[PDB]
Amino acid sequence: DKICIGYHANNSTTQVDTLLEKNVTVTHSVELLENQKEKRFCKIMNKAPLDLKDCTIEGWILGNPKCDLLLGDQSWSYIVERPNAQNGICYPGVLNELEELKAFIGSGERVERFEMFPKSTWAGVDTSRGVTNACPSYTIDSSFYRNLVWIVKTDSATYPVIKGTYNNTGTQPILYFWGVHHPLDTTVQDNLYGSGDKYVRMGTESMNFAKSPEIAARPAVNGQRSRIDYYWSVLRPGETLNVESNGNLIAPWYAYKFVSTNKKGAVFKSDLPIENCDATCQTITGVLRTNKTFQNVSPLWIGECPKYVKSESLRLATGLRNVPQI
Amino acid sequence: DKICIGYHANNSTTQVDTLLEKNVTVTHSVELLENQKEKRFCKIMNKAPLDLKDCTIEGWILGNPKCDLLLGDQSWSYIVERPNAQNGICYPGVLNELEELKAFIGSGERVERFEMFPKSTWAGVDTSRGVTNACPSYTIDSSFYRNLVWIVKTDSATYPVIKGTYNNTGTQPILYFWGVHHPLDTTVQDNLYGSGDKYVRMGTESMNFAKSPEIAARPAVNGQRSRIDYYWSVLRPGETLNVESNGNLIAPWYAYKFVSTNKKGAVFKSDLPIENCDATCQTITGVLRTNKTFQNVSPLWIGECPKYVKSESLRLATGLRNVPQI
Amino acid sequence: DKICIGYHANNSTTQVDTLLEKNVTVTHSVELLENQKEKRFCKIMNKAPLDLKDCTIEGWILGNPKCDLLLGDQSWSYIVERPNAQNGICYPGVLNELEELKAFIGSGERVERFEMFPKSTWAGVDTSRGVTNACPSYTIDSSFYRNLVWIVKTDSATYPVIKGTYNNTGTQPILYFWGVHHPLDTTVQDNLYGSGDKYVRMGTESMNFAKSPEIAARPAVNGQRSRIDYYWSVLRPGETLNVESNGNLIAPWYAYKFVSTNKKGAVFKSDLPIENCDATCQTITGVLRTNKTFQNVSPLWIGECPKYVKSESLRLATGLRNVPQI
Amino acid sequence: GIFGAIAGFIEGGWTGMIDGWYGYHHENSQGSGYAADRESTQKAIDGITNKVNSIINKMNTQFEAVDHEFSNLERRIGNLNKRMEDGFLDVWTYNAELLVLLENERTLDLHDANVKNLYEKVKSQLRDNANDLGNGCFEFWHKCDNECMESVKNGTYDYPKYQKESKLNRQ
Amino acid sequence: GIFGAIAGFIEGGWTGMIDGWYGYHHENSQGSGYAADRESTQKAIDGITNKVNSIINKMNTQFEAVDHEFSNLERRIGNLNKRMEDGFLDVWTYNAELLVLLENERTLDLHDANVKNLYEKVKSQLRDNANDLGNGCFEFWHKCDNECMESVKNGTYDYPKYQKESKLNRQ
Amino acid sequence: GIFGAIAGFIEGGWTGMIDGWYGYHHENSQGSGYAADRESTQKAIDGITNKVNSIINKMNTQFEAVDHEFSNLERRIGNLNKRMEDGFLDVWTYNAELLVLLENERTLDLHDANVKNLYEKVKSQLRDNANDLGNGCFEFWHKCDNECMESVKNGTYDYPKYQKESKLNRQ
Ligand SMILES: *[C@@H]1O[C@H](CO)[C@@H](O[C@@H]2O[C@H](CO)[C@@H](O[C@@H]3O[C@H](CO[C@H]4O[C@H](CO)[C@@H](O)[C@H](O)[C@@H]4O)[C@@H](O)[C@H](O[C@H]4O[C@H](CO)[C@@H](O)[C@H](O)[C@@H]4O)[C@@H]3O)[C@H](O)[C@H]2NC(C)=O)[C@H](O[C@H]2O[C@@H](C)[C@@H](O)[C@@H](O)[C@@H]2O)[C@H]1NC(C)=O
Ligand SMILES: *[C@@H]1O[C@H](CO)[C@@H](O[C@@H]2O[C@H](CO)[C@@H](O[C@@H]3O[C@H](CO[C@H]4O[C@H](CO)[C@@H](O)[C@H](O)[C@@H]4O)[C@@H](O)[C@H](O[C@H]4O[C@H](CO)[C@@H](O)[C@H](O)[C@@H]4O)[C@@H]3O)[C@H](O)[C@H]2NC(C)=O)[C@H](O[C@H]2O[C@@H](C)[C@@H](O)[C@@H](O)[C@@H]2O)[C@H]1NC(C)=O
Ligand SMILES: *[C@@H]1O[C@H](CO)[C@@H](O[C@@H]2O[C@H](CO)[C@@H](O[C@@H]3O[C@H](CO[C@H]4O[C@H](CO)[C@@H](O)[C@H](O)[C@@H]4O)[C@@H](O)[C@H](O[C@H]4O[C@H](CO)[C@@H](O)[C@H](O)[C@@H]4O)[C@@H]3O)[C@H](O)[C@H]2NC(C)=O)[C@H](O[C@H]2O[C@@H](C)[C@@H](O)[C@@H](O)[C@@H]2O)[C@H]1NC(C)=O
Ligand SMILES: *[C@@H]1O[C@H](CO)[C@@H](O)[C@H](O)[C@H]1NC(C)=O
Ligand SMILES: *[C@@H]1O[C@H](CO)[C@@H](O)[C@H](O)[C@H]1NC(C)=O
Ligand SMILES: *[C@@H]1O[C@H](CO)[C@@H](O)[C@H](O)[C@H]1NC(C)=O
Ligand SMILES: *[C@@H]1O[C@H](CO)[C@@H](O)[C@H](O)[C@H]1NC(C)=O
Ligand SMILES: *[C@@H]1O[C@H](CO)[C@@H](O)[C@H](O)[C@H]1NC(C)=O
Ligand SMILES: *[C@@H]1O[C@H](CO)[C@@H](O)[C@H](O)[C@H]1NC(C)=O
Ligand SMILES: *[C@@H]1O[C@H](CO)[C@@H](O)[C@H](O)[C@H]1NC(C)=O
Ligand SMILES: *[C@@H]1O[C@H](CO)[C@@H](O)[C@H](O)[C@H]1NC(C)=O
Ligand SMILES: *[C@@H]1O[C@H](CO)[C@@H](O)[C@H](O)[C@H]1NC(C)=O
Ligand SMILES: *[C@@H]1O[C@H](CO)[C@@H](O)[C@H](O)[C@H]1NC(C)=O
Ligand SMILES: *[C@@H]1O[C@H](CO)[C@@H](O)[C@H](O)[C@H]1NC(C)=O
Ligand SMILES: *[C@@H]1O[C@H](CO)[C@@H](O)[C@H](O)[C@H]1NC(C)=O
């Protein structure tokens, strides 16, 4: 008659590491790290992402003529920008505070496009010939940004002091754009805006802007040695914008009522496909469908994701040292 | 005859958590986290804080006419700014590098106000009519900043090239301010500064400044469609400032010898009352009087404070598992 | 007849600390922290550092006449700048974006000096008299930066629109410099560049620059009340630079083909001697020759160094509690 | 092992005992079988489950890297962001990997101790009414039927009841 | 428990023993009473005090958030500062909460071991001159007065002195 | 100590045993000597070596401070960089110092347990064929030559072989 004390063994070959010993086979354990992803983009809270396709962020909100697919109202859980997108700033020049603009746009979830300054706004000037071969549409060889108006003189008269005002009486901030044109020589300057010192001045309750054309011949980009300085700003609720210029003004035409997301903002630069799927965690390199605590997929994500670490595996022993007999 | 081995028990109901078990009652334990605060501001090292009351930081060091209570010399262990303070920049416009200015001021413990440029400095111009209904005092409907001088023309003559120089021969840096006025139209420009191109140029051994008026009609703020560009700088010990202008100059009048604190700097935006008390740790939301290692009150504080964490409780077991009989 | 169970003891007096007890003498232990350094600079991957000697970073890449020892091609594993170096910007003025320039230069390992714009480039002007007593060489009382050309008028004629172009057809980015001169009064302005509005305009596929002289008398520095605004930029591979000016131009003369290091970049400000030695870890305060895991020497280093901590000692027990008898 | 039971004086585990981490193997006239000690097994399950859940709870915050861009003249703040994000990455990678190694060591020791204590618990009841073979097995000096066996397993073994019989067989 | 003493083979604690963590309860002709083992109690007090002080010392640095403001065109560096400050907050919150859970577990085990070792220390001296009841209590096979009791408590119990008397009563 | 052996019921160490952490001292007709238990010593060496190497591996990343400069109008991002670098410095200083204190405590306990378990391993084989002196020493009730001694040390001691002789001398 015998009684023995003993412990569980099984057919486990799953191992863990300890401070004292590597490769310890245990009867039971749990993996805390996720390394699997669905290489695709899905919806977040049943809200679809915005595919910018062949347009860059700049091309999108500036209203590049080849970005009409995106034109107008958009809602998004996050933004997907394709790495080799060709349609950005068509007429050469710098969009000022570009990085801050991208960060601002990223912090939003919806824009509503509206007409902020109809062409009727600018008196004594031409609002019909503002096009360029640098900015073609899909059907027309010479067009321009859907949100801007390139203003030039009437055929022979001088460029007068034009003025515009907009009072944001709504509850939402307004993202709007404008520009200053810099001709390559004084000839083009005179041909388009006439003679004399030119200025572009704009102001709100909290912003002042003042710029003059800087005439010089710069290297040819998209067949242009001239440039445009593009600008952006945000008209706060209750604020008023005043526009005043006597030339070289790329005027604001359409703008965006901007809805800032309460949540976290994301802009993914990726070639991955957006499919008809749902997810709770969207990584820049794919979807994570897991209940695990850690992941080694990517530190860049939106939604409720596991903590990112460099580890290959984080396996906790739960059972005991597996010593099966024989 | 018997002897037994055993362990302490008592009437403790205080519990701790372990990795293995929650809610373990122990005979002895210590709470490491402080969650209590005195909802008030006290002195730090027996040095009183500076209450800005109804004035913002801008209103204070610009010398807003309604901030005379603060005017002159100040010493502080930290700064309290009230959230709904009304007296800041009275005549509309932007104080440039505002955030850096606040950070600089925060890093100090004392300012000494002195006259840096007496009105005698500016020859051939009027230093007596620089007032505005936008900047009233408590007794006068039209005044101006105590530290600046709004310079205009003599009744009919033109605005001459005025000059000023100051040699910091002291041992302390000097915080000073100046401005450039931007009229809404050329009419006001001519009425105040005459005709021709106007400039404001200032320079030291390490700083260059150059600005010209930018005339435009901006939305009315405090009954003004004009603006002032306010500026600030720090004249290092041994450096010299040269002021040169032919118009649109809001000249430096009074300035501050600045004493930078060796310790940590703080500016608390709060409605909490400053009372007649001492403290070693001053949180933005109150005083901590404790010897505990952690606190969950606030990450923002000055003085010797416990480490801030999100935890509700950090109780260490010191005694053993409490198992009282019966 | 007896058998006893027991444990090792020895003559160790080396102690460790535990959570439970301080000063525990153990038979065996290992120190993980290194506190020893060779107070000198050595080679890293058998590559020697660049000693700037009596020249600052500015004096070096601007081509200060007293920095000819450094002039030309340089390769470095890191840069040593001496704290009391005297030869920097000789003709007073600000080098714009100085901190970004230092960070950029620090991220490199080699520059190759070449002539980017020969003096032949600038037509209708004088390229022979651009010197100053503020910038003497070691043999001449009035010289100028080896990489810049101070352009002035021919003895009596006016200053014409000068132009220059450079097409980077190479595979490496080009670090280049230029300037704008600001005379103290209109007299010197007229004497050097003639009359009329002056401009300096430069542009690439991604950069626009435009500056005009700002005439004012600033405090005397190196016997000069005038100033020069120095600028820098990087001409990317395949980009083209166009220079256009009608006066006040300190033109680019020599530039640098820039080789960015794949590794980590370092600039050490130190008085320590560079000797003929090799090392794998170079701290700003000396060489570490160790296999230890931690060090308390400095957080600033280049190469493969141990982790920096504030600890005086990190000794791990490996053996047991030393209890020698008697 | 630290407590000397698992892979110790009890050389191996029992694949035959499938319903618990810790238990018994008995032999008597009615035959032989495995039985898990329900109390010690469940106590360990609750503890280990609490440990895993606690670790998960403490690890339930995330540092979030951003997609923010920086211009050519923003190399410093650009590099600041990179070093910060990499910094927290290294901290949390360290925290996770070190914790796992530490807790794995202690978890295995816990199981070892529970086996040791279960052995001690039986040794204490049986006293000299049984012979300790040194491998976790006890040979009774008396007949121990199914209810005698169960009394050992549930801690109510009656030593005086079998004292005289055991002594006689022992001596 | 890991060492099986506290809430183990010694089922409960003594509210009657107020002057120490670990001790004795004796019964003889002069009556009964509680006595703390001063040596083991003080050693534990010193260790635990050292642990608490060590934890406090290591936690004696503070990350300091700043009141710095950022303009509308400084969203990136503004968000950088926020993520940094929140980052260290999460790290230290983790460090504190995890350490407390870990040390609480080990502290309780320490007390458990000290009780176990105190029991072993008495068992070792008494040998067969006493009967182990299995609950931490020993019944002497001989008369053990106050000085005999104290000799057990201070580790100088004289086994040969009571050997013959114990044997006679035991047999 | 937690396991009560080192500086415990075995009051001190052996300077005479130079070839191992854990071992034996025997006395018989052929004289006396020290011998390290090779198995337990080597097992401990491998474990502790693994621990040290593991700690080194986890600590094998570095936060890197930069020599970047900031202008007078960059006090905020300048102070941001300083607080960040100091922040990680404090985190890693904490991690290293706390880990060392924790692991030192556990390392010493490990050695203590190994000694305890080695003692238990001998006690288990010898049974009543030897007398436990309470200090880790066993006095045989029989003649134990060099090969008898070695059988105890390598775990193959033959209790039945010396049972009758021991009993006679014991009784
Ligand atoms: C640990 O495990 C053991 C079993 O191995 C258990 O002890 C046994 O408990 C059962 C309770 O059901 C006892 O069975 C009783 O038997 C009597 C008559 O049996 C006679 O024969 C046995 C054979 O050995 C003799 O040893 C006895 O002395 C008896 O003379 C019976 O009258 C009694 O009560 C009713 O039984 C009928 C069925 O329900 C019912 O219809 C009738 O009206 C009776 O009223 C039980 O059936 C058994 O005898 C015990 N073993 C021994 C050796 O005595 C332990 O269970 C305890 O648990 C607590 C809660 C008590 O309530 C009892 O159940 C036991 O003392 C168990 N311990 C624990 C902690 O789980
Ligand atoms: C652990 O605790 C025990 C007590 O339970 C203690 O052992 C006792 O120590 C005391 C020391 O004071 C001894 O008392 C001595 O008594 C003799 C005469 O007593 C006789 O009666 C007893 C009754 O049982 C007999 O057993 C003895 O054999 C004696 O024949 C006395 O002469 C002696 O010395 C002086 O006492 C007078 C009072 O001070 C003094 O005026 C006179 O001039 C004498 O010189 C002591 O008083 C007692 O006998 C011990 N117990 C037993 C059973 O023998 C242990 O204390 C030890 O500590 C070390 C430091 C030694 O110096 C001694 O104190 C003990 O050996 C204690 N151990 C520890 C480690 O604390
Ligand atoms: C633990 O340590 C012990 C030693 O303390 C060891 O046990 C001994 O093993 C040796 C093996 O070499 C045995 O020696 C044999 O001796 C016989 C004849 O010896 C007689 O005298 C002894 C004296 O006490 C008697 O007790 C015996 O009963 C014998 O009658 C000899 O024939 C035998 O084989 C050859 O020896 C010659 C030399 O090589 C060779 O030339 C000849 O042709 C023989 O074929 C051995 O020499 C010794 O007797 C053992 N001790 C006792 C008390 O019996 C344990 O070693 C074991 O290891 C395993 C691998 C086996 O293969 C054996 O070596 C042992 O059983 C050791 N255990 C471990 C785990 O290490
Ligand atoms: C044995 O094999 C694997 C584990 O190695 C798994 O299927 C399970 O634990 C066992 N298989 C069955 C059929 O029980
Ligand atoms: C043990 O670790 C080694 C790594 O060198 C590898 O073979 C494997 O992970 C483990 N061996 C097994 C599971 O047989
Ligand atoms: C903007 O419109 C609102 C209309 O409710 C008006 O009250 C406000 O005065 C206007 N502001 C300006 C600057 O015109
Ligand atoms: C968590 O995921 C694992 C996948 O390995 C699964 O086995 C487990 O059941 C899941 N738990 C819950 C509560 O869904
Ligand atoms: C019992 O009650 C509380 C603790 O629960 C405290 O006052 C003290 O420990 C005890 N009271 C007294 C009077 O001792
Ligand atoms: C145990 O924890 C629970 C939380 O669900 C709460 O009731 C309390 O903190 C504890 N219970 C007590 C102290 O009775
Ligand atoms: C400033 O004043 C000091 C007076 O000690 C003089 O030495 C110095 O030259 C002055 N600097 C200038 C620029 O006037
Ligand atoms: C620390 O504060 C606690 C408050 O709970 C107090 O009981 C304790 O005595 C204090 N310690 C010291 C050293 O002042
Ligand atoms: C004893 O002295 C030191 C250690 O204290 C060291 O040289 C060595 O361990 C011993 N010396 C010799 C000669 O063995
Ligand atoms: C114990 O620590 C103290 C610090 O107060 C110091 O004397 C030394 O480090 C240790 N003492 C020794 C090694 O004797
Ligand atoms: C620069 O030079 C290359 C020579 O291969 C030429 O193809 C390119 O068009 C040039 N670019 C400009 C802007 O002149
Ligand atoms: C590491 O350095 C120490 C210096 O104390 C030396 O004793 C040891 O041998 C070195 N280890 C290796 C592998 O070089």
Residue numbers in the entry:
A (entry chain A), B (entry chain A), C (entry chain A): 1 to 326
D (entry chain B), E (entry chain B), F (entry chain B): 1 to 171
Task: Quote the study on this structure.
Receptor-binding specificity of HA is a key determinant for viral host range. HA molecules of human viruses preferentially bind to α(2,6)-linked receptors, those of avian viruses to α(2,3)-linked receptors, while those of swine viruses to both. Two H6 HA proteins, one from each group, were chosen for structural and functional investigation: A/chicken/Guangdong/S1311/2010(H6N6) (GD H6) in Group I and A/Taiwan/2/2013(H6N1) (TW H6) in Group II.
We used the pentasaccharide, α(2,6)-linked lactoseries tetrasaccharide c (LSTc), for X-ray crystallographic study of H6 HAs with human-like receptors. In contrast, TW H6 HA-LSTc has clear density for the first three sugar rings of LSTc. In addition, GD H6 HA has two hydrogen bonds with the main-chain nitrogen atom of S137 and one hydrogen bond with the side chain of E190, while TW H6 HA has one hydrogen bond with the main-chain nitrogen atom and one with the side-chain amine of N137, and one with the side-chain hydroxyl group of S228. In contrast, the side chain of N137 in TW H6 HA contributes a hydrogen bond with LSTc Sia-1. In TW H6 HA, the combination of N137, V190 and S228 results in a similarly positioned Sia-1 moiety of LSTc, thus likely alleviating the unfavorable interaction between Q226 and LSTc in cis conformation and resulting in substantially enhanced binding to human-like receptors. LSTc in GD or TW H6 HA deviates from each other at Gal-2: LSTc Gal-2 in GD H6 HA pointing towards the 130-loop and 220-loop, while LSTc in TW H6 HA exiting the receptor-binding site from the C-terminus of the 190-helix. Different from GD H6 HA, the combination of N137, V190 and S228 in TW H6 HA leads to a higher-sitting position of LSTa and LSTc within the receptor-binding site. This higher-sitting position alleviates the discriminating effect of HA1 226 for avian or human-like receptors. Thus LSTa and LSTc bind similarly in the receptor-binding site of TW H6 HA. This explains why TW H6 HA, with the hydrophilic residue Q226, interacts with human-like receptors in a similar way as pandemic H2 and H3 and transmissible H5 HAs that possess the hydrophobic residue L226.
